[PDB]
């Protein structure tokens, strides 16, 4: 075993050893719920006012292609009043600063990883992002920033390309679309090199993102920080936390921010994390 005990204490000791050089983070909606961003995929998270065949169609490419207006009216409803990354986002910025971050694979479209200081090279936005938007005409593909897109969503004006008057779409991956090539290209390379997989705020229910946990080498420890245990084999159809054969998987159950605080504390990073977050939060508050 690389972990001396299947606890957060064991993971922190591994992280400060010579054996742990390269960390992959896999993150989901659970890291952005304390920033006020809703889990868009959760049925338990105001649609009848549209002529949708089924509630789930508002996030399907097949429907968006037929009628984009529901998506954009909803985007106006859900658009955040502020974009303030969480302690969990800044923990990942610390990993980057400490030279430990190989890659962050995100299921989220909210841009908070970029605001927290992760560079495009550090990120695989598996489901794309609102950070940029593109004209949908294959011959044009004019790029637009989120400030432009936010202005059109609020106006209640369906966003149109200034050059060709085609629809402009946020660079998100709808349900029923292929993930970016970058997802597959990065996966092939990064999982040869990984020493630690940190799985934060995801119940691993979206494919093919959830398949990433099976790409870790057999020796690589996997730490889940999440409100609920996730990723175990389905006794109907994985992570092994609790069996007598468990050797590398650890669950820390709680809010993602509290788990990242607890791990930062073991690492001797609590004051650096507190100082980073308070500074960035003050900066964003003062915008």
């Amino acid at each position: 075993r690389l972990l001396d005990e299947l606890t957060l204490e064991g993971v922190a000791r591994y992280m400060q050893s010579e054996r742990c050089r390269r960390v992959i983070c896999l993150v989901g909606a659970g890291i952005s719920t304390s920033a006020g961003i809703p889990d868009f995929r959760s049925p338990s998270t105001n649609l009848e006012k549209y002529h949708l065949p089924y509630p789930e169609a508002i996030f399907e490419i097949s429907y968006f292609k037929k009628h984009p207006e529901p998506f954009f009216a909803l985007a106006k409803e859900l658009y955040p009043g502020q974009f303030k990354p969480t302690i969990c986002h800044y923990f990942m910025r610390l990993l980057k600063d400490k030279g430990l971050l190989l890659r962050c694979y995100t299921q989220n479209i909210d841009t908070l990883e970029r605001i927290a200081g992760l560079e495009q090279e550090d990120l695989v936005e598996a489901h794309g992002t609102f950070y940029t938007s593109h004209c949908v005409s294959a011959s044009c593909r004019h790029e637009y920033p989120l400030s432009w897109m936010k202005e059109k969503i609020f106006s209640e004006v369906t966003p149109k390309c200034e050059d060709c008057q085609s629809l402009v779409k946020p660079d998100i991956v709808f349900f029923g679309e292929s993930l970016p090539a970058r997802f597959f290209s990065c996966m092939q390379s990064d999982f040869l090199k990984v020493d630690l997989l940190l799985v934060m705020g995801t119940s691993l229910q979206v494919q093919p993102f959830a398949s990433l946990i099976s790409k870790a080498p057999l020796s690589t420890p996997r730490l889940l920080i999440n409100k609920e245990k996730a990723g175990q084999s389905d006794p109907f159809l994985g992570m092994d936390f609790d069996s007598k054969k468990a050797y590398r998987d650890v669950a820390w159950l709680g809010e993602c921010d509290q788990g990242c605080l607890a791990l930062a504390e073991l690492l001797g990073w609590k004051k650096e994390l507190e100082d980073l977050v308070r500074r960035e939060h003050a900066s964003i508050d003062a915008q």
């Binding site: 991956v173 709808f174 494919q207 093919p208």
Partner: peptide
């Protein structure tokens, strides 16, 4: 690729 699905 193997498309985005729940």
């Amino acid at each position: 690729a193997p498309r985005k699905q729940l």
